[PDB]
């Protein structure tokens, strides 16, 4: 296990924070993949958990978007990490959220809830996403507006950037929604896709197997529901050894906080 130093930390809500760490020189990955990271307990025993790398493959530093679980073995400790302190990291990437598992197309959809946006914070910054596909749709559904902030600022930084912030316009479309707090756009991803509301709001044609591709990251129950909706539009689940129209990955184990 490689120990890496935290370079920056930002909290967002009472259950969410993000941090950046130095990257192991031996680490080579594809945007969307995850790695095991952790800390040592009081007895020096490692507490490891899977984390999507939230930074693109070209970033010289690694970024992570994390939940804070009450009494959670890892995050009850990780939430207190400070710049200069170190975390543990297994520089062996894995995961199913890789562009190599999708057939080239015109529109790439990122469907995520909560911290599930993590792998997409990486992919939205991955040049290949805008090369192998023409448009990227970021659908992020959370309970409140504060939970959407990390993603909002990231999207804003991309669309507002002097250099590419103009070259991204029209290519990266952001569709955030809340399921509880009043917001200009609300509703679950499954519902807005099934009712066609999202197609209407974005002014686009319905989802189809020929031009649309999707990546899903939320609870297991969310993944299962979303998969059904994607299939109801003709898309099929693919893999690295057989690219199709969509791939999914659990954002966590269990029901979620
Ligand atoms: C492939 C994969 C990728 C993951 N990527 C991330 C990531 O990028 N960021 C992140 O914060 N976590 C991610 N997780 C979850 C992560 O592995 C840990 O569960 C998390 O850090 C909590 O650890 P814990 O020891 O404190 O709590 P645990 O004992 O691990 O979890 C207790 C519980 O709290 C809920 N929980 C755990 N993680 C989350 C979460 N992220 N969102 C909502 N509820 C949760 C679940 O119900 C869970 O059973 C990922 C998990 C998998 C399997
Ligand atoms: C060459 C200018 C590129 C501008 C688009 C990215 C704006 S967002 C930018 O992304 C980087 C990549 O992970 C991070 O290191 C950085 O901290 C973050 O602010
Ligand atoms: C002895 C050098 C290698 C140990 C680093 C692995 C992370 S372990 C980790 O370290 C942080 C301090 O940097 C502490 O704040 C935290 O409580 C501890 O669990
Ligand atoms: C952090 C990276 C953000 C993405 C910047 C705008 C992508 S622009 C995009 O790029 C592709 C190659 O990558 C080309 O094939 C395509 O023709 C061009 O329009």
mmCIF file of N, CA and C and ligand atoms in Angstrom, residues 10 20 54-56 58-61 63 121-122 125 153-154 156-159 161-165 168, ligand 2:
data_model
loop_
_atom_site.group_PDB
_atom_site.id
_atom_site.type_symbol
_atom_site.label_atom_id
_atom_site.label_comp_id
_atom_site.label_asym_id
_atom_site.label_seq_id
_atom_site.Cartn_x
_atom_site.Cartn_y
_atom_site.Cartn_z
ATOM 1 N N UNK A 10 -11.829 20.204 0.764
ATOM 2 C CA UNK A 10 -12.979 21.099 0.752
ATOM 3 C C UNK A 10 -14.190 20.307 1.213
ATOM 4 N N UNK A 20 -7.783 16.280 -2.580
ATOM 5 C CA UNK A 20 -6.855 15.906 -3.623
ATOM 6 C C UNK A 20 -5.613 15.353 -2.952
ATOM 7 N N UNK A 54 -11.973 10.899 -8.947
ATOM 8 C CA UNK A 54 -12.779 12.004 -9.467
ATOM 9 C C UNK A 54 -12.040 12.959 -10.397
ATOM 10 N N UNK A 55 -10.753 12.705 -10.597
ATOM 11 C CA UNK A 55 -9.947 13.525 -11.484
ATOM 12 C C UNK A 55 -9.676 12.722 -12.754
ATOM 13 N N UNK A 56 -9.536 13.406 -13.899
ATOM 14 C CA UNK A 56 -9.272 12.763 -15.192
ATOM 15 C C UNK A 56 -7.900 12.083 -15.217
ATOM 16 N N UNK A 58 -5.452 12.490 -17.094
ATOM 17 C CA UNK A 58 -4.339 13.395 -17.369
ATOM 18 C C UNK A 58 -3.918 14.302 -16.210
ATOM 19 N N UNK A 59 -4.712 14.342 -15.144
ATOM 20 C CA UNK A 59 -4.397 15.188 -13.991
ATOM 21 C C UNK A 59 -3.240 14.580 -13.203
ATOM 22 N N UNK A 60 -2.226 15.391 -12.907
ATOM 23 C CA UNK A 60 -1.061 14.916 -12.167
ATOM 24 C C UNK A 60 -1.341 14.633 -10.691
ATOM 25 N N UNK A 61 -2.513 15.051 -10.219
ATOM 26 C CA UNK A 61 -2.926 14.811 -8.839
ATOM 27 C C UNK A 61 -4.231 14.030 -8.863
ATOM 28 N N UNK A 63 -8.030 13.254 -7.291
ATOM 29 C CA UNK A 63 -9.102 13.933 -6.574
ATOM 30 C C UNK A 63 -10.143 12.893 -6.173
ATOM 31 N N UNK A 121 -16.906 13.182 -12.503
ATOM 32 C CA UNK A 121 -16.146 14.410 -12.293
ATOM 33 C C UNK A 121 -14.860 14.166 -13.081
ATOM 34 N N UNK A 122 -14.502 12.890 -13.200
ATOM 35 C CA UNK A 122 -13.308 12.478 -13.930
ATOM 36 C C UNK A 122 -13.576 12.500 -15.428
ATOM 37 N N UNK A 125 -14.028 15.571 -17.530
ATOM 38 C CA UNK A 125 -12.760 16.240 -17.780
ATOM 39 C C UNK A 125 -11.844 15.386 -18.660
ATOM 40 N N UNK A 153 -19.975 23.496 -9.341
ATOM 41 C CA UNK A 153 -18.753 24.276 -9.476
ATOM 42 C C UNK A 153 -17.799 23.683 -10.497
ATOM 43 N N UNK A 154 -17.764 22.357 -10.576
ATOM 44 C CA UNK A 154 -16.903 21.686 -11.538
ATOM 45 C C UNK A 154 -17.402 22.000 -12.946
ATOM 46 N N UNK A 156 -19.315 24.437 -13.895
ATOM 47 C CA UNK A 156 -19.129 25.869 -14.104
ATOM 48 C C UNK A 156 -17.686 26.175 -14.510
ATOM 49 N N UNK A 157 -16.735 25.538 -13.834
ATOM 50 C CA UNK A 157 -15.318 25.743 -14.122
ATOM 51 C C UNK A 157 -14.964 25.332 -15.546
ATOM 52 N N UNK A 158 -15.643 24.307 -16.054
ATOM 53 C CA UNK A 158 -15.397 23.819 -17.406
ATOM 54 C C UNK A 158 -16.020 24.723 -18.465
ATOM 55 N N UNK A 159 -17.266 25.121 -18.236
ATOM 56 C CA UNK A 159 -17.979 25.968 -19.181
ATOM 57 C C UNK A 159 -17.530 27.424 -19.121
ATOM 58 N N UNK A 161 -14.269 28.329 -18.227
ATOM 59 C CA UNK A 161 -12.834 28.431 -18.482
ATOM 60 C C UNK A 161 -12.491 29.242 -19.732
ATOM 61 N N UNK A 162 -11.522 30.162 -19.617
ATOM 62 C CA UNK A 162 -11.102 31.003 -20.743
ATOM 63 C C UNK A 162 -10.721 30.209 -21.993
ATOM 64 N N UNK A 163 -9.865 29.207 -21.815
ATOM 65 C CA UNK A 163 -9.405 28.380 -22.925
ATOM 66 C C UNK A 163 -10.498 27.539 -23.583
ATOM 67 N N UNK A 164 -10.940 26.489 -22.897
ATOM 68 C CA UNK A 164 -11.965 25.603 -23.441
ATOM 69 C C UNK A 164 -13.391 26.001 -23.077
ATOM 70 N N UNK A 165 -13.540 26.873 -22.085
ATOM 71 C CA UNK A 165 -14.867 27.309 -21.687
ATOM 72 C C UNK A 165 -15.491 28.113 -22.809
ATOM 73 N N UNK A 168 -16.466 23.892 -24.912
ATOM 74 C CA UNK A 168 -17.248 22.909 -24.173
ATOM 75 C C UNK A 168 -18.737 23.218 -24.297
HETATM 76 C C1 LIG B 2 -5.892 23.895 -19.827
HETATM 77 C C2 LIG B 2 -7.161 24.453 -19.140
HETATM 78 C C3 LIG B 2 -8.227 23.374 -18.836
HETATM 79 C C4 LIG B 2 -9.512 23.907 -18.150
HETATM 80 C C5 LIG B 2 -10.603 22.838 -17.769
HETATM 81 C C6 LIG B 2 -10.631 22.226 -16.333
HETATM 82 C C7 LIG B 2 -11.244 23.164 -15.289
HETATM 83 S S1 LIG B 2 -11.552 22.512 -13.651
HETATM 84 C C8 LIG B 2 -9.882 22.051 -13.031
HETATM 85 O O1 LIG B 2 -9.579 20.736 -13.550
HETATM 86 C C9 LIG B 2 -8.278 20.202 -13.227
HETATM 87 C C10 LIG B 2 -8.218 18.780 -13.861
HETATM 88 O O2 LIG B 2 -8.580 17.756 -12.914
HETATM 89 C C11 LIG B 2 -8.007 20.252 -11.685
HETATM 90 O O3 LIG B 2 -6.649 19.931 -11.412
HETATM 91 C C12 LIG B 2 -8.275 21.699 -11.176
HETATM 92 O O4 LIG B 2 -8.006 21.714 -9.791
HETATM 93 C C13 LIG B 2 -9.737 22.098 -11.483
HETATM 94 O O5 LIG B 2 -10.036 23.413 -11.043
#
